[PDB]
Symmetry: C4
Subunit: 389 residues, 4 copies
């Protein structure tokens, strides 16, 4: 049975801890994949952490990170939410140096991108077998969300980028059913830049908060309808939620245009709350350290800088990184609405630390009806490791 | 289908060995969590050992126990009864430095407490997702049973303490259905102290035997009804079952009041037998070594010191620790009554031994209709470990 | 649904390799229990290897075999046929230094014996929980088969010995349903000795071939009916199948009496074939090395020494050990009859080899309708191991 | 329910990456079998990688490859497609130094060959138990496909060779149902040689592309009907697809006869496409390095050398090896036709590299309706390993 997922995103006053995998502490002696870009998506039965592996294990010579990013060994694999990315509980998903995955209520669909940069291929798995393919349409690093894709009433949606990472590129919305592409759309967005979207369903449409790696310190936003007609632009709020970014005082919002005039970015997320928004970000304006989440009144729809709530989850003494959005299927939460959840990736090692390797653990949070006290569920690993000698 | 659990606790003349995990012997070379406070609860299909992890493994540098107690890395996880707490068979449960868990017949409900001491949060998982929340109501280490909670006819009950650990604090009884709090109650108990309850169902009500960490060497007892009206007091028997405690000869029982005038405590348990009680305790009056279980005639209801039976399970040359209560669901035992079982935690390392680490293995016992000979199913590990060099 | 198991044992001309676990080769680097006395029994879905563990792993200091035989850490655990006895695929069964296990068609029943020698207890698990108990009735090492027990039409049978191991002792047949003892019987056998029976169903009765550790180099045999009325005696064949034993030429058979006048023994097995028998034995008359299986015409019923077939499975340059019987449930083989199978334990280390440890791997064979060539599927491990330095 | 598998093989313009196990990179620190000849076959639910183990692990002294090829320790085991051949996720299949396996829609059937070279036995497992047997009929290394066997409408087919490996031998086609041989056929092929077939269903018949290890650099081909009447010969195409082989320019095809006049070979595969063929091969004419797949128009039926497509999957700087064919069951792909897939084995170590050991990882590809860019999903392991010191 197909998951409806037409309900509205729940309105929430705070986020409770869902899980924490401690992969890297565990990785010190146990057998754990050196991973990167983990993310969470849910079936109507269990939620899973998906990730990308080098094929190498923590504390092993193959974790030498001279092994490139988009390498032929890179794969998408998965475990259950909370478990470390260990070999012995890992499920194979796809060959991928970039991925999205989501469940429609019947089976898991995953999309893994691999191949050469100039001519990459994106393979669609449905129920654990390839069912379809997308080739690079612009010849420049075909790539996708690295967070959950979105399924409504049996059709699954996601967003991909083919083009340069630091200037204008091209963007597309795909629609598959049972792992067959059944629709696509080009996205007009001259001046604007879209990378690594974080998406979720909301009122029978797909809402995304993405990454502008060209010029904007605000996050681009798009809203997709089942007919693949779309609206696109930026998160209106007069507060920047990208890294690097400038200061809140020296920032003017926009619903239409990049602002901030800064190059680089990071994957991040946001949830519509009526006309409010929960926007997450790192605490540092420049580095991937700390993580917090602000609620701005009328933020989804105006250049508001009115903060109604602020909750810290990783303190600014500790390393953060990527973060993304997903919902709890109604079939799991029991609510009549879609419970908004997010995960925060905590990167340890290169570039900031003196190890030959890089990986990340994770923490997962879900919307609750109460305020949650600030804390820091940070990574915990004690660097460097034996391998680093 | 909801588990009835309205039947009476079975009357039993002794306890048979259920399981023994040997986690720490196994941990010498294999990949085993450094754990603390394991406990057992049963679904209508299988019984599980739940525990709290540091995220670290035995014989690994991260088992350095300078890592605090209520740490952000602490999690509740679980395996099947008898299996060691190994990474590769472990199931993630919750973020927690204090936990309760129980099954209602349809799904597992778990409750994990985490956050800062002054403002802690307790997340309720149902079927593996957070479904609800309790915030600290007294701002002083919100915390709970560390043993099985109790489910009757679809609603699950448990007991939490917010307050100081060495004087008067506050105590509450919670009632959830499908992971939603649907009732709560404050517990009047001036002079009395309640920590870390061990509970089980009995005649359609919840009976607990808990820990007084303030002044009493007897165990506080409470009996909860589905309407959250309760009775509270102490185990009547004129014999003290806490550690530290005094001697049996120099002790006068009470059904209402702490006695013994000693500060510290330990988690322990007891089963009503009509008006008799099976009370467990450590063999040493002062240290967590050895473990035995006495049956006192009319002990639940009078200041009796009449010992009908005594059974040793861990000898006084070996380390014990915490212990708690659970029942076999009728659906597993086949009996028309609720078979009483308990687990005994065996702590190795700090404080009593020269290691940088602390963990525990476990042994599980269940009520039988016969007398069982005394023996010592003690831990077995040969300390210290490689890491300790 | 209960397994019928009333059909006759199949008549077979040879045995095909079922499985080989290679536990000890694997154990060299992987995480494998140091085990002893593995055996096989089948559900109507899969067959499993059960074993006894020290709780220790190969190549670990806890495999130091100064750790006694009937120790408090000893447990019965299980994996699927063919898999090594590894921690991460192991299922907990029972606390035991002696065990039997069998499946009735609905659930697994296991029986584990533990406790002190003078007053041992045997716990019956049904569907993974204790359901009943047998205490030592003669106060002298209560103990059992170490091979599959036998289930016919919903009731399961097995055989236990309480007494001395080198003279006259006592013997009993137990009958349980859904893990409740529902019948028992004492076995008159003055002069005769019964240890460690190997049993299987055959024409709606239970047939066993056991170990005489008192005086007989032939194997005692018993045949049990559902009403627990029995017949008992020895395997008639004029050929000795125990170790140590004498030579075939200097041996006179008996259907009633021990013969051979030699003390020690070993667990072994035999299958009735109409009036013929497949008897297994080690190749050496004195040591547990090599393993072969002879078919003697009219061997079950006369002092025949007529060998119709001989098949070698472990060559006499390699270590053998215990061996036992089990059948394939009709629901798995598809035959209209009960396919006879056996397993051979291959012991490595103490006493014959210079290691601080002892364990065993295994090979499993099943009756086929053809002759199978002789070969040697021996253990394979290269001794000693790192730990032995 | 039986899998139909009567549909035609899909016509495909290219192959997408299915999986990549990275076993050997992973094997550097984790617990991974030293394997050889992995292959893939699919149930109507999941696809699996089957392999042969020494019983030894990577980086362990038992991976010393002086341990012979057809050894008594050799076993067939299996994991899910994409997962490494790790101990802890491995399922036992059979005792085998040569194997085939396939699923009929109800259960897995496997065939493992073991025993002595002069008198080998092939055991048939159905649903995880032996159900039947084939003894060596020519007394010279009875052996089989090392790739998926083929099931149509409930009966499973495969091909075996008994004889010498470098001259004329004997060849047979077997037909089992539910693990019982129900038909067999001798194959007249004087002058021609058949080893290690790669097979798949196609239009309700079984098509194989095999290995001529006697004289032919082209691949022998056979087509089997459910009545075990067959046609046999060679892949017509005027292009050689074996290793070693000569050059394309100096080669004349044949539909009937070996050509190339070279001794040795390698396992490889081919798919009929109407009258076209997708033939795979190594890139080197002499060594097992690189892997590519050519589509030759009218190749199945004429001496065509017309290349319509060429796709590289392992570049000629990297080690390849064996390769074989399998299909996706309709129940998984959703197509109305049989999706052709293949796997390529990548051998590391002896003979070409300075290690004491030999194993292989793998990559899996499936027919898609598009052209896929060339890339190299090569092994990745960094040789030699710790053990090699
Ligand atoms: C290529 C466009 C950008 C996305 C804004 O590159 C990402 C920049 C980035 C970051 O830290 O912001 C990380 C992404 N990435 C992917 C990978 C490998 O595919 C898996 C570790 N490595 N780094 C990069 N993605 C890819 C497909 O290489
Ligand atoms: C805080 C009140 C008391 C309970 C009587 O503290 C326990 C005292 C205790 C004991 O040995 O009696 C142990 C409990 N504990 C929990 C923890 C961590 O949360 C998991 C290892 N460490 N110690 C302690 N509980 C918490 C929430 O820290
Ligand atoms: C006690 C009677 C005999 C059985 C003929 O002892 C067995 C003698 C024996 C042998 O090698 O023939 C082995 C059995 N055994 C059991 C055990 C432990 O319980 C598990 C390793 N060790 N050895 C022994 N059984 C027990 C309950 O200790
Ligand atoms: C015996 C006929 C040939 C097949 C063309 O031998 C294969 C030659 C070969 C190759 O590299 O082409 C490898 C096959 N093989 C099997 C094995 C062991 O059975 C498992 C590693 N080793 N090598 C060999 N097969 C067997 C049954 O030994
Ligand atoms: Ca940016
Ligand atoms: Ca106290
Ligand atoms: Ca004897
Ligand atoms: Ca050739």
């Amino acid at each position: 049975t197909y998951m409806n997922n037409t309900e509205a995103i729940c309105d929430v006053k705070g986020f409770a801890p869902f899980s924490k995998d401690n992969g890297i502490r565990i990785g010190s002696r146990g057998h754990i994949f050196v991973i990167r870009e983990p993310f969470v998506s849910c079936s109507p039965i269990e939620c899973r952490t998906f990730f990308l592996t080098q094929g190498s294990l923590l504390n092993d010579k193959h974790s030498n990170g001279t092994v490139k990013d988009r390498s032929p060994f890179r794969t998408l694999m998965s475990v259950k939410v909370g478990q470390s990315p260990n070999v012995y509980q890992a499920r194979f998903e796809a060959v991928a140096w970039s991925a999205t995955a989501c469940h429609d209520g019947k089976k898991w669909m995953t999309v893994g991108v691999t191949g050469p940069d100039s001519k990459a291929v994106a393979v669609i798995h449905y129920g654990g077998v390839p069912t379809d393919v997308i080739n690079s349409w612009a010849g420049d690093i075909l790539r996708t969300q690295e967070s959950s894709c979105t399924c409504i009433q049996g059709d699954c949606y996601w967003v991909m980028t083919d083009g340069p990472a630091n200037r204008q590129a091209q963007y597309r919305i795909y629609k598959a059913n049972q792992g067959r592409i059944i629709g696509q759309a080009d996205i007009s967005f001259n001046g604007g830049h879209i990378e690594e979207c974080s998406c979720y369903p909301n009122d029978g449409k797909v809402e995304c908060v993405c990454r502008d790696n060209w010029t904007g310190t605000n996050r681009p936003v798009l809203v997709i309808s089942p007919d693949l007609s779309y609206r696109v632009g930026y998160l209106c709020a007069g507060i920047p939620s990208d890294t690097p970014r400038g200061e809140d005082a020296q920032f003017t919002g926009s619903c239409t245009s990049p602002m901030g005039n800064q190059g680089y970015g990071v994957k991040g997320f946001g949830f519509r709350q009526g006309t409010d928004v929960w926007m997450g970000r790192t605490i540092s304006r420049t580095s991937r350290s700390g993580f917090e989440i602000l609620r701005i009144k009328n933020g989804w729809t105006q250049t508001s800088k009115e903060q109604v709530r602020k909750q810290v989850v990783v303190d600014n003494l500790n390393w953060s990184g990527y973060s993304g959005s997903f919902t709890l299927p109604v079939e799991l939460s029991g609510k009549d609405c879609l419970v908004p959840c997010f995960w925060v990736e905590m990167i340890r090692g290169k570039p900031e630390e003196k190890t030959i390797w890089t990986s990340s653990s994770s923490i997962v949070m879900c919307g609750v009806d109460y305020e949650i006290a600030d804390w820091s569920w940070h990574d915990g690993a004690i660097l460097p490791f034996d391998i680093d000698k």
